[PDB]
Amino acid sequence: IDLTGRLALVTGASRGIGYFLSLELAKRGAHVIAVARTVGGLEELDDEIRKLGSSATLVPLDITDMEALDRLGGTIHERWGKLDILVANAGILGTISPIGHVEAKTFEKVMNINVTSVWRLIRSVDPLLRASDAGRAIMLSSGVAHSCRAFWGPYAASKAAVEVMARCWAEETKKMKLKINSVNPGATRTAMRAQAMPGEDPETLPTPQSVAEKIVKLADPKLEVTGKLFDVRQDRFLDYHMPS
Numbered sequence: 001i002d003l004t005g006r007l008a009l010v011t012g013a014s015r016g017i018g019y020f021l022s023l024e025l026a027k028r029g030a031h032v033i034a035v036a037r038t039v040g041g042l043e044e045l046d047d048e049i050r051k052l053g054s055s056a057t058l059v060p061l062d063i064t065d066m067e068a069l070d071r072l073g074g075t076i077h078e079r080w081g082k083l084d085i086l087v088a089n090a091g092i093l094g095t096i097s098p099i100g101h102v103e104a105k106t107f108e109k110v111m112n113i114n115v116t117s118v119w120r121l122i123r124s125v126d127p128l129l130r131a132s133d134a135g136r137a138i139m140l141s142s143g144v145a146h147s148c149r150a151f152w153g154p155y156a157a158s159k160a161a162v163e164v165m166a167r168c169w170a171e172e173t174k175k176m177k178l179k180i181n182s183v184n185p186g187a188t189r190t191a192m193r194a195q196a197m198p199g200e201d202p203e204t205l206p207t208p209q210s211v212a213e214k215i216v217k218l219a220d221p222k223l224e225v226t227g228k229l230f231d232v233r234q235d236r237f238l239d240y241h242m243p244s
């Protein structure tokens, strides 16, 4: 997959999948705009990016700072005039507990970060993605969005909302060059261990690098798929099914 001359925006870039996917994108010639909360974490990512032939644009910001997201879109437009790849990876787990035990502040934060800030980002860079000759949006989700695991309610619901926004966006744009898909990255040996599936061996959970390596396929200008869920563990696109 050749991403030479491509511009990618990765949120939650300073750790976990966001970190490793930034690297996989950079390995393939993309220029990464790396968004995260702290400058230090972005600098650590940048050290690794510089070890490749590459260099990144570091954008520390509060993902809930809704005007900062608007400004980022303006910055990208002025400098490059388009955006080729969006990786919406920013997100928090909240706290595992019965739905009625959840703290209000935690519920509101889960929804504001996991849902509203994703929508804000979409609004900000949708025009830029349309200016690409092959815009690609990659929306990070979780298997619990569909398994509806006990005690994971707010998180599960937030990720279901993200997938539905992505599906609607894909339907609205399906005749365009833009393709939008969600991703279930599965559990990794570090990131999201607790999300391992029944029948998935905790001793052989994938490296985050190997997971990021598969996700980068969704950035391919040759990709024809839109509105689907990419299951990394199964290494294939899944179809959504109506209740019946």
Ligand SMILES: [Br-]
Pocket (backbone or CB within 6 Å): 011, 012, 013, 035, 036, 037, 063, 090, 091
């Ligand atoms: Br972030």
Ligand SMILES: [Br-]
Pocket (backbone or CB within 6 Å): 015, 016, 017, 018, 191, 192
């Ligand atoms: Br992660």
Ligand SMILES: [Br-]
Pocket (backbone or CB within 6 Å): 094, 095, 096
């Ligand atoms: Br917890």
Ligand SMILES: [Br-]
Pocket (backbone or CB within 6 Å): 172, 173
């Ligand atoms: Br539209």
